[PDB]
Amino acid sequence: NVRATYTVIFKNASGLPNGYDNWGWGCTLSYYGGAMIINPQEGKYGAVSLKRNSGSFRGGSLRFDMKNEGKVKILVENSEADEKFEVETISPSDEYVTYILDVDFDLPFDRIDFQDAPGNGDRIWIKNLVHSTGSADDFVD
Amino acid sequence: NVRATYTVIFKNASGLPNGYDNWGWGCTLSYYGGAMIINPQEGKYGAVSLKRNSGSFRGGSLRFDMKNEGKVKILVENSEADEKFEVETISPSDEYVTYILDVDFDLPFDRIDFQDAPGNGDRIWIKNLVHSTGSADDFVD
Ligand SMILES: OC[C@H]1O[C@@H](O[C@H]2[C@H](O)[C@H](O)[C@H](O[C@H]3[C@H](O)[C@H](O)[C@H](O[C@H]4[C@H](O)[C@H](O)[C@H](O[C@H]5[C@H](O)[C@H](O)[C@H](O[C@H]6[C@H](O)[C@H](O)[C@H](O)O[C@@H]6CO)O[C@@H]5CO)O[C@@H]4CO)O[C@@H]3CO)O[C@@H]2CO)[C@@H](O)[C@@H](O)[C@@H]1O
Numbered sequence: 251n252v253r254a255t256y257t258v259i260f261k262n263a264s265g266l267p268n269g270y271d272n273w274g275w276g277c278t279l280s281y282y283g284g285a286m287i288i289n290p291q292e293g294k295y296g297a298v299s300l301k302r303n304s305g306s307f308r309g310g311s312l313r314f315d316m317k318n319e320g321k322v323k324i325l326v327e328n329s330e331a332d333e334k335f336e337v338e339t340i341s342p343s344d345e346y347v348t349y350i351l352d353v354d355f356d357l358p359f360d361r362i363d364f365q366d367a368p369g370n371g372d373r374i375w376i377k378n379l380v381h382s383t384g385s386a387d388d389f390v391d
Numbered sequence: 392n393v394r395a396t397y398t399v400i401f402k403n404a405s406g407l408p409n410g411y412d413n414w415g416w417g418c419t420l421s422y423y424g425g426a427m428i429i430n431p432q433e434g435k436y437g438a439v440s441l442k443r444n445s446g447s448f449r450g451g452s453l454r455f456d457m458k459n460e461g462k463v464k465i466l467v468e469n470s471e472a473d474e475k476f477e478v479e480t481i482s483p484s485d486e487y488v489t490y491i492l493d494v495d496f497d498l499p500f501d502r503i504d505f506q507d508a509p510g511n512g513d514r515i516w517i518k519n520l521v522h523s524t525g526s527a528d529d530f531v532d
């Protein structure tokens with residue numbers, strides 16, 4: 251079979267997802283009209299870090315809508331091993347864009363990070379975050 | 392917080408959900424246009440029994456669309472303890488109806504059952520099966 255398991259982390263955010271903590275640094279988190287808004291401080295390379303309290307994801311792909319004033323680095327991490335893995339760096343956009351990214355990390359992951367890579371304080375807006383156990387090329391919304 | 396975790400088991404079924412086996416008895420399973428179709432044999436009290444291969448659900452609520460020629464019993468079970476729990480019996484309907492049911496079982500569950508309770512061979516059609524960690528009254532699709 252080709253069928254995946256799709257985990258909806260959040261659709262329209264007005265607060266944190268059930269069963270997640272924020273282990274982020276160097277930013278203020280707020281919400282508007284269903285979007286999670288990251289407001290990083292200049293010089294801190296700030297990020298949101300969504301921490302799954304119980305369990306872990308393995309491989310698969312991450313799907314989300316994002317708009318962003320600057321370049322944004324996407325990472326995943328394993329909190330037990332304390333290892334991190336850089337998935338992609340995404341260019342700036344004034345409009346929301348849908349991304350579907352393969353996660354090639356060789357460990358399970360319980361942290362998903364969206365980071366202000368240039369460290370200039372550029373804001374980030376996220377909607378519609380979903381994990382699939384399958385590949386990005388096989389992802390059906 | 393009031394926010395739940397929503398697990399989509401299947402939306403439009405053309406086969407079994409990823410990570411589930413069928414432990415059903417006394418019926419033939421088929422599919423049409425996104426519906427899982429249970430064809431039970433007269434006298435067998437047949438059922439589909441969706442078995443989660445890894446992990447278990449705890450409490451919460453089950454949401455699904457169903458149409459059904461006869462009365463249908465909904466159960467959940469814990470395969471380790473080998474204990475079962477009767478959630479509801481639902482009357483016949485010639486059209487699909489959306490149900491959202493609280494699960495009051497005192498153990499985790501890894502089996503979800505849809506059964507031909509009268510044992511006359513009446514067919515059952517299921518779409519859009521989702522579990523929430525929260526109550527039926529708080530369930531937002
Ligand atoms: O309270 C809750 C629990 O907390 C636990 O402790 C947590 C803690 O809360 C936090 O989550 C922490 O997270 C780590 C994370 O694991 C990871 O190591 C992360 O690494 C960061 C690093 O710190 C920097 O932010 C780094 O920034 C770089 C940029 O990404 C970029 O590459 C940039 O490039 C520039 C380049 O260097 C040059 O200047 C060029 O000219 O310009 C470039 C920019 O245009 O360089 C930046 C700086 O190097 O990114 C990495 C990757 O994200 O850091 C965070 C924070 O430390 O984890 C701990 C757990 O270990 C526990 O305390 C628990 O008990 C609590 O319950």
Ligand SMILES: OC[C@H]1O[C@@H](O[C@H]2[C@H](O)[C@H](O)[C@H](O[C@H]3[C@H](O)[C@H](O)[C@H](O[C@H]4[C@H](O)[C@H](O)[C@H](O[C@H]5[C@H](O)[C@H](O)[C@H](O[C@H]6[C@H](O)[C@H](O)[C@H](O)O[C@@H]6CO)O[C@@H]5CO)O[C@@H]4CO)O[C@@H]3CO)O[C@@H]2CO)[C@@H](O)[C@@H](O)[C@@H]1O
Pocket residue numbers: 414415416435436437438440464466468473475504506507508509510
């Ligand atoms: O191969 C895969 C693995 O299989 C494992 O073994 C599984 C096995 O495959 C299967 O899944 C089995 O499932 C059990 C289940 O756990 C549960 O015990 C279930 O119980 C049924 C019961 O058998 C009857 O079907 C019962 O029917 C009643 C109706 O619901 C209704 O109440 C009806 O009412 C009538 C009344 O009696 C009277 O006649 C009145 O006038 O009219 C009424 C009708 O109008 O009465 C019916 C009969 O009592 O329903 C219950 C509840 O659903 O039974 C199934 C099947 O046995 O579980 C095992 C695991 O233990 C392992 O082998 C593994 O190794 C494999 O890998």
